[PDB]
Amino acid sequence: VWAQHLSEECRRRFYKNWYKSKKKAFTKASKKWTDDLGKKSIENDFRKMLRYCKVIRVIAHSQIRLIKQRQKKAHVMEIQLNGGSIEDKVKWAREHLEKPIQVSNVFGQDEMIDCVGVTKGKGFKGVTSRWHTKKLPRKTHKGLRKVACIGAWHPSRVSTTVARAGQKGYHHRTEINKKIYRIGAGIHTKDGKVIKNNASTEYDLTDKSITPMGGFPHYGEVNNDFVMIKGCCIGSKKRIITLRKSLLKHTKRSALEQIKLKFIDTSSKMGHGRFQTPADKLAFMGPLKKDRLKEEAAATTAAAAAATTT
Amino acid sequence: NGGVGRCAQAKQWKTTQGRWPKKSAEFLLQLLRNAEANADCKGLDADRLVVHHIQVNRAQCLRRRTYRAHGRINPYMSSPCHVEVILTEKEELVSKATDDEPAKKKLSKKKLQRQKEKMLRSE
């Protein structure tokens, strides 16, 4: 069962060349909501999804517009509902067609996520770079960077277990047991602009943001809400990661700990950044041949533009 | 075919391997120039011509030589071409209609008496 309205960026997913089209998806299936609408198809389908099915999922899409990437074409995916009484999974999802869902209502803090995604691609590589064979001695004719024996005489073929060259990275991985450190509260403006305060902690009270000074390098603007995840995750630049509730129990007393961040470094990652906020770059350092001159090329000219006039 | 490398423009031909033979494709324009300039004198109107038959034949080769290691000489052979076009005009095509010949005998419809003509129209 689809929905009645699908948003435009989240309906470019069905188009390899969208800019040229007539945008005719979903111009027909939406009209099953404004026909007789139950004996059209739809109420029988929700009754068909209730009588027979044991797993109910949900097609949700992202809002790739809000992140200011180039992409404009939302990723849709199936996200399984996992509460009891099969009547309740459809009753939860008949309600939520077109209504938006936040990270704060799926994940919490101090929670163990599995991140799923495709690693960073690295090309056609040798066998040393890829499989971590020992390099050969320096006086090797025809190549140090090889395996020297890719197998015995018998079995008289090369096997699959022998380390071999050909592509590195861009593999689909599922990395387990990453911990949420902070569910962010992103976007904007309760009364004045509260697009601050994600990095304000109990010890800091500086509002700054989770964005560094100069943006995140290459992937760079963060204004929406977020999940802050212990050390590393898969992928690259801008890459869609899929966060996942844990398929495990957590008895391990290192994965049961409640946390509290004292400090979040938002110094500049385009170099060796020395200051957290741009205020501190003006508290420690002073005004430059810059905001010295630009604060004295406005109030000075406002009494010097009339000097030709008078 | 091999080892010509796989290009982007060859999805169109339902192939992967394709290439851009510039000098080859330039002699087939100097050919179709004459094959169009021959429909001129015959009075054919060129925007209806279709390349009916095209074929290439390998002509007699030409002799050159490389020079190899340890004092050896190998043949360096240019392999020429023979191309033929016939271009034929395309109108609204009434294609073909084969001939009819009677194999008629005179005892045809007395064993078919009880079967076909006075047997009434059914459904």
Partner: protein, 205 residues
């Protein structure tokens, strides 16, 4: 609708030794067959369970070294255990036996028309006629659960749905021929073409 004698023989695989049914089927399919075996989770193997489990685990060990993806694929469903027995008793590298294998359908647990169709037994493959009291036996449905087939209890829930659909189609067809037995007293004065002429078959019919 059709088949080279009847539509297909549908053999219920319940109570039948696997290799004594796989050979009468492979013979019948080379003669022009069209069979279906349903309930392949219920076929039997003689000897106790571990004796057969051993035999299958040794089958799982055969795999080509230079590529395991070339090697003997070890299908684990009880229907594709039965198909393994039948494929050995067929020449499957000729077209004659590969067409003989194309007339074979085998099912874990009786779906899709062969639930309302007609089930025949093969009384020479049947276990209660050949084996002894105090020989031990297993099912292929237990063997397949212990070796990597995930749908033992999918097809147990699927089957008691089907065996509760049949609980009412035997409740209708038991009362619906309380009337055929009723109607055969209201046409007792027929003319007399039952009263004498079907005393050819003739004390019961």
């Amino acid at each position: 609708m059709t088949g080279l004698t009847n539509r297909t023989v549908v053999i219920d695989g319940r109570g039948h030794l696997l290799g004594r049914l796989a050979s009468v089927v492979a013979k019948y399919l080379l003669q022009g067959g069209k069979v279906a075996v349903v309930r392949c989770e219920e076929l039997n193997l003689s000897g106790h369970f571990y004796r057969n489990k051993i035999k299958f685990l040794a089958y799982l060990r055969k795999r080509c070294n230079v590529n395991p993806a070339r090697g003997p694929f070890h299908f684990r469903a009880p229907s594709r255990i039965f198909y393994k027995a039948v494929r050995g008793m067929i020449p499957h590298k000729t077209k004659r036996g590969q067409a003989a294998l194309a007339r074979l359908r085998v099912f874990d647990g009786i779906p899709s028309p062969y639930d309302k169709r007609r089930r025949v037994v093969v009384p020479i493959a049947m276990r209660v006629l050949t084996l002894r009291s105090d020989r031990k036996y297993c099912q292929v449905g237990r063997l397949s659960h212990e070796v990597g087939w995930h749908y033992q209890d999918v097809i147990k829930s699927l089957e008691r749905k089907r065996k509760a659909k049949l609980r009412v189609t035997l409740k209708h067809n038991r009362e619906l021929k309380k009337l055929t037995v009723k109607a055969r007293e209201n046409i007792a004065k027929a003319a007399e073409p039952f009263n004498k002429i079907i005393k050819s078959y003739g004390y019961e019919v």
